[PDB]
Enzyme design. Sequence first.
Site, PDB file in Angstrom:
ATOM      1  N   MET A 133       3.556  40.640   4.849  1.00 58.48           N
ATOM      2  CA  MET A 133       3.912  39.284   4.409  1.00 58.48           C
ATOM      3  C   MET A 133       2.958  38.238   4.993  1.00 58.48           C
ATOM      4  O   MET A 133       2.821  37.136   4.464  1.00 58.48           O
ATOM      5  CB  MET A 133       5.342  38.948   4.852  1.00 58.48           C
ATOM      6  CG  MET A 133       6.398  39.770   4.120  1.00 58.48           C
ATOM      7  SD  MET A 133       8.082  39.090   4.393  1.00 58.48           S
ATOM      8  CE  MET A 133       8.264  39.403   6.188  1.00 58.48           C
ATOM      9  N   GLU A 144       0.245  37.433   8.895  1.00 62.87           N
ATOM     10  CA  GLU A 144      -0.255  37.900  10.187  1.00 62.87           C
ATOM     11  C   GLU A 144      -0.721  36.740  11.036  1.00 62.87           C
ATOM     12  O   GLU A 144      -0.878  35.639  10.533  1.00 62.87           O
ATOM     13  CB  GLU A 144      -1.337  38.995  10.042  1.00 62.87           C
ATOM     14  CG  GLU A 144      -2.754  38.499   9.848  1.00 62.87           C
ATOM     15  CD  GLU A 144      -3.729  39.660   9.703  1.00 62.87           C
ATOM     16  OE1 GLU A 144      -3.998  40.052   8.546  1.00 62.87           O
ATOM     17  OE2 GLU A 144      -4.144  40.243  10.733  1.00 62.87           O
ATOM     18  N   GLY A 145      -0.793  36.940  12.332  1.00 65.15           N
ATOM     19  CA  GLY A 145      -1.204  35.843  13.185  1.00 65.15           C
ATOM     20  C   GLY A 145      -1.496  36.249  14.607  1.00 65.15           C
ATOM     21  O   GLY A 145      -0.570  36.472  15.398  1.00 65.15           O
ATOM     22  N   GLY A 146      -2.790  36.314  14.903  1.00 57.42           N
ATOM     23  CA  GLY A 146      -3.359  36.614  16.207  1.00 57.42           C
ATOM     24  C   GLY A 146      -2.901  37.885  16.879  1.00 57.42           C
ATOM     25  O   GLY A 146      -3.725  38.744  17.209  1.00 57.42           O
ATOM     26  N   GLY A 172      -0.302  40.106  15.829  1.00 51.28           N
ATOM     27  CA  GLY A 172       0.325  41.145  15.034  1.00 51.28           C
ATOM     28  C   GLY A 172       0.382  40.893  13.544  1.00 51.28           C
ATOM     29  O   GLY A 172      -0.002  39.826  13.048  1.00 51.28           O
ATOM     30  N   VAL A 174       2.977  40.925  10.161  1.00 52.72           N
ATOM     31  CA  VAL A 174       4.380  40.737   9.854  1.00 52.72           C
ATOM     32  C   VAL A 174       4.715  41.509   8.593  1.00 52.72           C
ATOM     33  O   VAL A 174       4.094  41.280   7.544  1.00 52.72           O
ATOM     34  CB  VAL A 174       4.737  39.245   9.658  1.00 52.72           C
ATOM     35  CG1 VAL A 174       6.252  39.096   9.510  1.00 52.72           C
ATOM     36  CG2 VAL A 174       4.208  38.388  10.800  1.00 52.72           C
ATOM     37  N   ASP A 202       1.744  25.946  20.541  1.00 49.57           N
ATOM     38  CA  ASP A 202       1.087  26.364  19.301  1.00 49.57           C
ATOM     39  C   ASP A 202       1.775  25.832  18.046  1.00 49.57           C
ATOM     40  O   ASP A 202       2.012  26.579  17.083  1.00 49.57           O
ATOM     41  CB  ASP A 202       0.848  27.887  19.243  1.00 49.57           C
ATOM     42  CG  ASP A 202      -0.386  28.270  18.410  1.00 49.57           C
ATOM     43  OD1 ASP A 202      -1.120  27.340  17.939  1.00 49.57           O
ATOM     44  OD2 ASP A 202      -0.611  29.478  18.215  1.00 49.57           O
ATOM     45  N   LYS A 240       1.947  24.465  14.563  1.00 49.70           N
ATOM     46  CA  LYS A 240       1.033  24.459  13.418  1.00 49.70           C
ATOM     47  C   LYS A 240       1.800  24.881  12.175  1.00 49.70           C
ATOM     48  O   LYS A 240       2.877  25.454  12.296  1.00 49.70           O
ATOM     49  CB  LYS A 240      -0.169  25.379  13.677  1.00 49.70           C
ATOM     50  CG  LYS A 240       0.170  26.844  13.942  1.00 49.70           C
ATOM     51  CD  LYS A 240      -1.168  27.586  14.171  1.00 49.70           C
ATOM     52  CE  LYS A 240      -0.935  29.028  14.519  1.00 49.70           C
ATOM     53  NZ  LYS A 240      -2.258  29.714  14.684  1.00 49.70           N
ATOM     54  N   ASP A 298       7.107  31.815  16.594  1.00 54.06           N
ATOM     55  CA  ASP A 298       6.054  32.195  17.554  1.00 54.06           C
ATOM     56  C   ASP A 298       6.137  31.533  18.915  1.00 54.06           C
ATOM     57  O   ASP A 298       5.453  30.551  19.154  1.00 54.06           O
ATOM     58  CB  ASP A 298       4.647  32.031  16.942  1.00 54.06           C
ATOM     59  CG  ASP A 298       3.660  33.008  17.560  1.00 54.06           C
ATOM     60  OD1 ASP A 298       3.768  33.270  18.791  1.00 54.06           O
ATOM     61  OD2 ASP A 298       2.811  33.544  16.815  1.00 54.06           O
TER      62      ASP A 298
HETATM   63  C1  LIG Z   1       9.120  35.063  13.067  1.00 56.11           C
HETATM   64  C2  LIG Z   1       7.978  35.493  12.142  1.00 56.11           C
HETATM   65  C3  LIG Z   1       7.415  36.855  12.557  1.00 56.11           C
HETATM   66  O1  LIG Z   1       8.582  35.642  10.865  1.00 56.11           O
HETATM   67  C4  LIG Z   1       7.799  35.535   9.760  1.00 56.11           C
HETATM   68  C5  LIG Z   1       6.466  35.192   9.816  1.00 56.11           C
HETATM   69  C6  LIG Z   1       5.747  35.018   8.618  1.00 56.11           C
HETATM   70  C7  LIG Z   1       4.382  34.563   8.583  1.00 56.11           C
HETATM   71  O2  LIG Z   1       3.850  34.338   9.812  1.00 56.11           O
HETATM   72  C8  LIG Z   1       2.638  33.619   9.907  1.00 56.11           C
HETATM   73  C9  LIG Z   1       2.397  33.495  11.434  1.00 56.11           C
HETATM   74  C10 LIG Z   1       2.301  34.874  12.138  1.00 56.11           C
HETATM   75  C11 LIG Z   1       3.568  35.004  12.997  1.00 56.11           C
HETATM   76  C12 LIG Z   1       4.246  33.656  12.924  1.00 56.11           C
HETATM   77  O3  LIG Z   1       5.280  33.312  13.484  1.00 56.11           O
HETATM   78  N1  LIG Z   1       3.502  32.811  12.111  1.00 56.11           N
HETATM   79  N2  LIG Z   1       3.660  34.360   7.477  1.00 56.11           N
HETATM   80  C13 LIG Z   1       4.309  34.615   6.283  1.00 56.11           C
HETATM   81  C14 LIG Z   1       5.616  35.025   6.188  1.00 56.11           C
HETATM   82  C15 LIG Z   1       6.365  35.237   7.380  1.00 56.11           C
HETATM   83  C16 LIG Z   1       7.728  35.630   7.352  1.00 56.11           C
HETATM   84  C17 LIG Z   1       8.457  35.755   8.514  1.00 56.11           C
HETATM   85  C18 LIG Z   1       9.896  36.112   8.369  1.00 56.11           C
HETATM   86  N3  LIG Z   1      10.757  35.938   9.424  1.00 56.11           N
HETATM   87  O4  LIG Z   1      10.346  36.533   7.299  1.00 56.11           O
END
Ligand SMILES: CC(C)Oc1cc2c(OC[C@@H]3CCC(=O)N3)nccc2cc1C(N)=O
Length: 286
Positions: free
Chosen positions: A31, A33-35, A37, A39, A144, A146, A162
């Site tokens: 779905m 990703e970010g630094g 890991g 997702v 962080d 953003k 995050d």
């Molecule tokens: C709590 C985080 C893991 O949950 C998500 C994160 C996502 C995401 O994350 C983009 C970046 C990297 C991780 C983050 O928190 N920000 N992009 C796109 C969709 C995402 C969907 C979920 C979710 N809970 O369904």
Amino acid sequence: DTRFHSFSFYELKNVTNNFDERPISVGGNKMGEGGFGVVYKGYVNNTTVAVKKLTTEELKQQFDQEIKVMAKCQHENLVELLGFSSDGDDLCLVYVYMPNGSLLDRLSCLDGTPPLSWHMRCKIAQGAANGINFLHENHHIHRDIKSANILLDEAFTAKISDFGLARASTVMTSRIVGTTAYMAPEALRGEITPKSDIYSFGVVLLEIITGLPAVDEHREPQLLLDIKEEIEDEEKTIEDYIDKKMNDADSTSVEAMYSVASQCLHEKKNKRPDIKKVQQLLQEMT
Ligand SMILES: CC(C)Oc1cc2c(OC[C@@H]3CCC(=O)N3)nccc2cc1C(N)=O
């Protein structure tokens, strides 16, 4: 000892199609990703979930901080952690599924989602400010802030995400972290203070108004925060910058949001409004 569920790494593996890294559209589970890991979308206990699979000991440190912070912080505008896994090949964090993904992605209309209306953006800005206020009231600095860290639930409610780098709140640090295109000058120099979260939030407000990313190489200027200067110099107008992909924006409320963003972006940390003042201004905006 937390209320979070300890999952088997193998169950998370099984429910994400063996951590299928292809995007959802082509049959995979990725779905975003970010630094630290990737997702993945998963399905556990008849529920859709998000699974984030995560240097070395520092990674374990960010996994622990995310858990410690989420145990202490529950609020309407913070994403909810459900569980975790540490018994297998890699560390995983399990969260409530956010059907509308991130604000960053919804602003770019990633994967063909419709543009967010001005009405929805105002609700999102207010929600995110409410989530930061909760953090600050509870002496936490996010570090962080953003648009990739502002998620959108089933009702497009803002959920801050995050918390891996969050700090217990001024002091200096040897390890400067954050996202450069959103960072306050004092944070780039190693200062740790909640005043920096307000600056980063001003950048997010500019993204909401303009629909532009914080940084764009093939774009000029490359950094969004620099439009504050183009405008103050009367070289441009906020109107020139309003996101054209809306049919319901109104100049008065857009200018009230830009005014808040402008105050957040004061270069001198002490001249910025605190989060309570930001919440108040966004409430009068609507
Ligand atoms: C709590 C985080 C893991 O949950 C998500 C994160 C996502 C995401 O994350 C983009 C970046 C990297 C991780 C983050 O928190 N920000 N992009 C796109 C969709 C995402 C969907 C979920 C979710 N809970 O369904």
